[PDB]
Design a protein around this ligand. Structure first.
Ligand SMILES: Cc1cc2nc3c(=O)[nH]c(=O)nc-3n(C[C@H](O)[C@H](O)[C@H](O)COP(=O)(O)OP(=O)(O)OC[C@H]3O[C@@H](n4cnc5c(N)ncnc54)[C@H](O)[C@@H]3O)c2cc1C
Ligand SMILES: Cc1cc2nc3c(=O)[nH]c(=O)nc-3n(C[C@H](O)[C@H](O)[C@H](O)COP(=O)(O)OP(=O)(O)OC[C@H]3O[C@@H](n4cnc5c(N)ncnc54)[C@H](O)[C@@H]3O)c2cc1C
Ligand SMILES: Cc1cc2nc3c(=O)[nH]c(=O)nc-3n(C[C@H](O)[C@H](O)[C@H](O)COP(=O)(O)OP(=O)(O)OC[C@H]3O[C@@H](n4cnc5c(N)ncnc54)[C@H](O)[C@@H]3O)c2cc1C
Ligand SMILES: Cc1cc2nc3c(=O)[nH]c(=O)nc-3n(C[C@H](O)[C@H](O)[C@H](O)COP(=O)(O)OP(=O)(O)OC[C@H]3O[C@@H](n4cnc5c(N)ncnc54)[C@H](O)[C@@H]3O)c2cc1C
Ligand SMILES: NC(=O)c1ccc[n+]([C@@H]2O[C@H](COP(=O)([O-])OP(=O)(O)OC[C@H]3O[C@@H](n4cnc5c(N)ncnc54)[C@H](O)[C@@H]3O)[C@@H](O)[C@H]2O)c1
Ligand SMILES: NC(=O)c1ccc[n+]([C@@H]2O[C@H](COP(=O)([O-])OP(=O)(O)OC[C@H]3O[C@@H](n4cnc5c(N)ncnc54)[C@H](O)[C@@H]3O)[C@@H](O)[C@H]2O)c1
Lengths: 272, 271, 272, 271
């Protein structure tokens, strides 16, 4: 029939390049016969604060409330807040998830951060049994599309701000891959606010061209979970024999699994 | 007679996070500190940047840009009063303690929003004064983080990976960027599977540390003097500093790894 | 706690239980280091009728006068009547607002009703941009303290008068929450004039005990405004996908958002 | 030759509310009604209950209670003359029309005050005779409300919530409590966004309705016969009526929802 795509947008202004890049992605994907659902978080007045109000039924323990535990029960028993559930249905349907946002304080905007917190509940988005490459969204692909005010030189190995690969790691590994997603190469649009209108149009056309064949792309490299002992008594440490195979190599596996050695160039930006 | 701000991002008074805020307040007051708080959930703090944050005339309502508009609003004094209140707390504060649970490898959304609305240009950073030359070089900040995951999971060989990498965007990208000297984070791992007697110990450990907090060495970040702070040079590391570093085996920091090894616990232990 | 509290009182007699409960609240709060400001509306000879006299400057349109529009301009340009402005300053300062009044005709007294009408002006207390949980007083907490002549059985589900939750809804949702307030559990003191002296003393002591730790209480549940399309073309209706998630559930969200189903027990009286 | 009272709570003669008062007067006179008015703003009506409302000897000036004192003052005939004047209008009136703009989900303060000062015990209610057995069971009342908000906002799925809930305290708690049979309210939503052609239609609709107003079915309120009207029983619903209602899916009314569903438009449409 054709595949489904979710576009999460974290910018308040319709006049923004971020909004322009959401519209371009929708356009490009529909024209290739994709169904396209959106979460325009500001337009939705999405609520990004985790609270008791997120559970609409009986709390297991109202006197000693813990959001991890309570939210998971509420999912299983089906009395999560309906605004959460609506976003979860969009994700279950979605084969590709595009996150369009401006980098703010080296991270996702608060409203997108809150979306992850309220929507990516246990049992739904991760278990513990099944982390990382074995997680519930291993069927799905995700891509970050980020704009910055700072130039790309500032996020180079020798830039004042430092390696962009380090900045992306918590989001791409810690949030997206943790839940199973195969993470595609991020679309980095540097110093957008010093780019003249003719060149922005080019960037949009570049973005649209990429989305034509997005599904065929190689994902970023993360250490398979098979390299680790996935149980508590072992501490989720990297297997003793994998440490032995890696002792000799000069490069580490990834930004987070640098292993006290060099990080593979553009681990979080380019695939191999 | 120094001042301390405690920012707390947890909704429940029954939490260990709340317990660690109370312990810090206690310990600091007893050493003659003034202690101001921002309990963000109790304040029902609003973490979403919007036009409503500027209370006066916009420079350009048809083409609104939060960076530029917020900065004018600071200079002309028509920021939203809830923002201004937090800024006054910071101007007064010598030490800032951020108490929060790690959520999705980061600060909670409400604390993230606080940074976004409160750390406005000209007030918290300019670009002519970045990093060690920034407006808060007089001040010290420390993260106090709790996790659900065990510390083995955030070791070099842990499933989740090096905690130094996770802390970098916050400690360098937000705190140091604005000038703060960043102290060793208080990392309290897998708190919900720590027995009661050991939690009591952790609180007492926290209180003991805060007695002599001010004397501590800060974490190492590359001085901005190692870089060409102008656009034509690209804010790249000076050509002669690259020459001095060519030979060394370790990089400077997590973000300035320079394609080499990261100094062990760059974001966790001081030099 | 160097926090501020406003106590609005709508009873004419100093000999009243209502006055006794104002005094008890002031006592209890001061002793916990609160600043306490009062609006004793009868003692102030407060004027509760909206008129042109409420605007002291130039009317925008004297031939076709509309209090909503004119009052809002007068706030922005700073020429509201000084008696209104005085009350507004009390509100801006106040973290907690306590309304102490006798139920009169299933509602607030006329003088308190007038206070709402003259003091809760647009831009100050509400905009249509920011309604309900996004409103200007989301930082503040409010509580109703109501006395009745009728017994509590009369306002039970099977009482002659009917559910008290229905009676409170217009005030707590329509007035307090509309302006942003987090609304705490109302203090309902039923049939006070047929309570023996020893039990009245108990009620006062109960009230004082509650106010010690008032700030830590959970607020009443109102449907978040994030469940709705906050714009005119959509009709401020509940989002289409939230209605889909709620179609199946047996209980409605609140007294006003009952959705043609059962109302959550004591939605306007107890928190969850 | 029946009589009608029109109570109006709007200050401006240029208002749609005033236009709807004039239309009702017109329509009713033309059908041979006598029409008395209470234009509360024009009367400079005083809506605050005070001691000044009793003009004779108080029973207990040191411990004053408005319920008790006002009732004695009615029986002994020394109520304030402005109250008495309004009471005479009510005694004469067969139909009472309340024309007002919704203000804060309620009647305006001045109309609220009118109820408080005019609807005194013994005159408008006793505890002997509440609801359908009350003194005004001979009379009919109708609310004519204008709103600024659109009707979608007061639908089951509207931001503001069910308008049936909003009307309940007024129609049941004030009007029916005193005996009135309450007719379907005339709801004129978002009048200030209605073009002139459609306003003319609404007025004509109002006038057409008033021609045959007296024949209309009233709104459904639970008869007081479903309850034990005595204090020892607590004015609770009879044990055998609860038994008849156990099985039904819909409750009786908005206030007597009985923990179940409210009958659709209980306070807006007759059954
Ligand atoms: C709180 C906060 C923190 C921040 N922190 C960081 C940080 O840590 N690091 C960092 O690098 N940056 C940071 N920034 C900067 C931020 O990343 C940039 O402001 C953002 O990336 C710019 O993207 P935009 O879509 O908002 O741009 P806009 O300025 O909204 O858009 C750029 C230009 O494109 C124009 N345009 C829009 N659509 C079109 C179209 N279809 N065709 C042609 N022209 C078009 C616009 O009118 C405008 O002139 C921060 C900003 C904020 C508010
Ligand atoms: C949305 C979300 C995302 C998350 N993502 C991550 C993630 O990416 N990585 C990660 O590692 N974790 C994650 N977590 C987990 C989070 O780090 C932990 O839940 C948190 O750190 C636990 O601290 P707490 O204060 O919340 O614990 P609590 O359960 O509130 O406290 C722990 C125990 O201490 C007790 N206690 C309370 N006060 C005292 C006292 N005074 N003295 C002694 N004992 C006391 C409590 O009663 C309880 O038994 C996430 C959680 C959420 C909600
Ligand atoms: C116009 C009007 C309409 C009304 N409509 C309704 C209605 O629709 N529904 C309804 O249920 N009720 C209604 N009522 C009744 C009203 O709610 C009650 O009369 C009111 O709540 C009683 O409170 P009070 O403070 O006036 O009581 P009071 O009678 O003034 O006080 C109660 C008792 O407590 C004593 N007392 C005072 N101070 C102290 C103290 N410090 N310690 C101990 N004892 C003390 C007093 O002397 C007295 O004996 C209405 C009343 C009016 C005037
Ligand atoms: C303090 C306060 C609180 C409020 N609270 C609420 C609330 O909680 N909820 C809510 O929904 N609303 C609320 N409102 C708004 C109120 O409900 C509306 O403003 C009011 O109902 C609109 O009717 P009006 O008579 O005032 O209209 P107007 O605007 O005075 O008149 C309506 C239009 O009809 C025209 N018109 C006048 N006479 C005629 C005629 N003879 N023929 C044809 N056209 C004519 C007028 O010129 C105008 O264009 C509140 C208002 C105030 C002042
Ligand atoms: N990390 C951050 O978020 C960050 C840091 C610094 C600056 N900024 C943003 O960048 C702005 C910097 O402005 P500025 O005063 O430094 O000037 P500018 O950088 O916008 O213009 C001057 C410089 O631009 C460069 N440049 C390259 N191509 C150019 C072209 N075609 N035309 C003109 N200049 C060209 C040149 O090196 C020149 O020295 C800030 O106002 C802010 O918006 C963001
Ligand atoms: N709810 C309450 O508690 C309360 C309290 C007091 C007053 N009120 C009432 O609420 C009113 C608030 O006014 P409002 O916010 O409803 O005004 P509004 O936003 O409805 O007025 C502007 C209208 O014009 C339309 N419009 C104009 N140009 C347009 C265009 N080019 N394309 C599309 N649509 C266009 C807008 O969509 C909108 O419907 C007050 O004046 C008062 O009457 C309500």
């Amino acid at each position: 029939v054709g595949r489904r795509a979710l576009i999460v947008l974290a910018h308040s202004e319709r006049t923004s390049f971020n909004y322009a890049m959401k519209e371009a992605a929708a356009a490009a994907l529909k024209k290739k016969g994709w169904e396209v659902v959106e979460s325009d978080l500001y337009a939705m007045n999405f609520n990004p604060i985790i609270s008791r109000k997120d559970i609409t039924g009986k709390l297991k323990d109202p006197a000693n409330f813990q959001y991890p535990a309570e939210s998971v029960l509420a999912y299983k028993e089906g009395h999560l807040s309906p605004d959460i559930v609506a976003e979860q249905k969009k994700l279950e349907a979605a084969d590709l998830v595009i996150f369009q946002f401006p980098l703010q304080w080296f991270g996702v905007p608060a409203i997108l951060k809150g979306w992850f917190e309220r929507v990516f509940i246990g049992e739904f988005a991760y278990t513990y049994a099944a982390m990382y490459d074995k997680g519930p969204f291993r069927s799905k692909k995700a891509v970050l599309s980020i704009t910055t005010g700072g130039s790309g030189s500032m996020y180079s190995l020798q830039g004042i701000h430092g390696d962009m690969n380090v900045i992306l790691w918590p989001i791409q590994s810690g949030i997206l891959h943790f839940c199973g997603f195969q993470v595609l190469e991020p679309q980095l649009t540097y110093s957008i606010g010093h780019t003249p209108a003719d060149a922005r149009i080019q960037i949009l056309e570049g973005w649209k061209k990429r989305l034509e064949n997005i599904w065929d792309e190689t994902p970023l490299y993360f250490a398979p979970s098979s390299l680790f002992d996935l149980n508590f008594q072992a501490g989720f440490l990297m297997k003793k024999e994998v440490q032995d195979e890696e002792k000799n190599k000069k490069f580490g596996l990834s930004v987070g699994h640098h292993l006290g050695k060099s990080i593979p160039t553009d681990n979080q930006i380019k695939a191999r």
